[PDB]
Design an enzyme around this catalytic site. Structure first.
Site, PDB file in Angstrom:
ATOM      1  N   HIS A   1       0.861  -1.381   0.112  1.00  0.00           N
ATOM      2  CA  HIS A   1      -0.073   0.086  -0.194  1.00  0.00           C
ATOM      3  C   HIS A   1       0.749   1.087  -0.127  1.00  0.00           C
ATOM      4  O   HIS A   1       0.248   2.410  -0.378  1.00  0.00           O
ATOM      5  CB  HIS A   1      -1.123   0.142   1.160  1.00  0.00           C
ATOM      6  CG  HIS A   1      -0.623   0.375   2.609  1.00  0.00           C
ATOM      7  ND1 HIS A   1      -0.522  -0.655   3.548  1.00  0.00           N
ATOM      8  CD2 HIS A   1      -0.185   1.413   3.018  1.00  0.00           C
ATOM      9  CE1 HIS A   1      -0.031  -0.085   4.530  1.00  0.00           C
ATOM     10  NE2 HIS A   1       0.212   1.544   4.409  1.00  0.00           N
TER      11      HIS A   1
ATOM     12  N   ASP B   1      -0.225  -7.509   1.971  1.00  0.00           N
ATOM     13  CA  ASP B   1       0.517  -6.102   2.248  1.00  0.00           C
ATOM     14  C   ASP B   1       2.073  -5.941   2.078  1.00  0.00           C
ATOM     15  O   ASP B   1       2.529  -5.784   3.180  1.00  0.00           O
ATOM     16  CB  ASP B   1      -0.206  -5.437   3.090  1.00  0.00           C
ATOM     17  CG  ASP B   1       0.156  -3.864   3.117  1.00  0.00           C
ATOM     18  OD1 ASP B   1       0.570  -3.481   1.798  1.00  0.00           O
ATOM     19  OD2 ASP B   1      -0.529  -3.285   4.006  1.00  0.00           O
TER      20      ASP B   1
ATOM     21  N   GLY C   1       1.438   6.487   8.618  1.00  0.00           N
ATOM     22  CA  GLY C   1       2.928   7.335   8.773  1.00  0.00           C
ATOM     23  C   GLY C   1       3.755   6.240   8.992  1.00  0.00           C
ATOM     24  O   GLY C   1       5.199   6.516   8.464  1.00  0.00           O
TER      25      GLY C   1
ATOM     26  N   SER D   1       3.374   3.107   7.881  1.00  0.00           N
ATOM     27  CA  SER D   1       3.211   2.339   6.907  1.00  0.00           C
ATOM     28  C   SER D   1       4.337   1.651   6.456  1.00  0.00           C
ATOM     29  O   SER D   1       5.163   2.463   6.074  1.00  0.00           O
ATOM     30  CB  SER D   1       2.364   2.935   5.790  1.00  0.00           C
ATOM     31  OG  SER D   1       0.813   3.339   6.137  1.00  0.00           O
ATOM     32  N   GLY D   2       4.508   0.401   6.036  1.00  0.00           N
ATOM     33  CA  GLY D   2       5.370  -0.331   5.273  1.00  0.00           C
ATOM     34  C   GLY D   2       6.980  -0.604   6.400  1.00  0.00           C
ATOM     35  O   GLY D   2       7.779  -1.216   6.086  1.00  0.00           O
TER      36      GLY D   2
END
Length: 223
Positions: A40, A84, A175, A177-178
């Protein structure tokens, strides 16, 4: 990261920031030329920033390297966020050092209770939003299968695991994310999704990296 704490300058050498004229996601260095992140967190022209602490200030130990390609998992589901994960190849190899180092992939999944390190420059508040300058940390344990399934009824696939505190107050957020979820030196998870941030009974849901090790290896090798 909600309810976390300042990690300290480059105390998480494998943590990277995905940049698009601004920080928009976190990531993990797995080797001198590859970064693991969330599918994402995809977008063209990403600029990977390694050796960062205060993302708002050039401190002199950073290495900005453009991603030459961002490969999202072929089975990524944008709605549920199932699968994801994303691999980002660097236009050039990063110079590895004490402030820029890779994290090992797992060779087996982590057990419930395994405490982990989650980090990022995401939103630090469970209500509203406030972003930090320096990297924030959080020691969170992996949640048992049953408690994870109870929090997100029918929303937890075998490529996901929960980690955090069901009583809330401490969690990852937008924020992050990943970003990484390192347990015993192994990257077991990727900041994926969740209902709100730091809510009671609504812990962070993370990508189960152990499930994608063969894919990662296969992708890296043929790229």
């Amino acid at each position: 990261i909600v309810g976390g704490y300042t990690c300290g300058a480059n105390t998480v050498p494998y943590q990277v920031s995905l940049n698009s004229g601004y920080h928009f996601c976190g990531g993990s260095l797995i080797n001198s030329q590859w970064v693991v992140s969330a599918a994402h967190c995809y977008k063209s022209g990403i600029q990977v920033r390694l050796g960062e602490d205060n993302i708002n200030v050039v401190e002199g130990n950073e290495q900005f390297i453009s991603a030459s390609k961002s490969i999202v998992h072929p089975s990524y589901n944008s709605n549920t966020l199932n699968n994801d994960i994303m691999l980002i190849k660097l236009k050039s190899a990063a110079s590895l050092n004490s402030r820029v180092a890779s994290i090992s992939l797992p060779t087996s999944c982590a057990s419930a209770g395994t405490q982990c390190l989650i980090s990022g420059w995401g939103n630090t508040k469970s209500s509203g939003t406030s972003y930090p300058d320096v990297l924030k940390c959080l020691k969170a344990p992996i949640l048992s299968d049953s408690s994870c399934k109870s929090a997100y009824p029918g929303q937890i696939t075998s490529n996901m695991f929960c980690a955090g505190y069901l009583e809330g107050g401490k969690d990852s957020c937008q924020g992050d994310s990943g970003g990484p979820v390192v347990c015993s030196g192994k990257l077991q998870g990727i900041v994926s999704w969740g209902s709100g941030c730091a809510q009671k009974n609504k812990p962070g849901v993370y990508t189960k990296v152990c499930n994608y090790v063969s894919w990662i290896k296969q992708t890296i090798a043929s790229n």
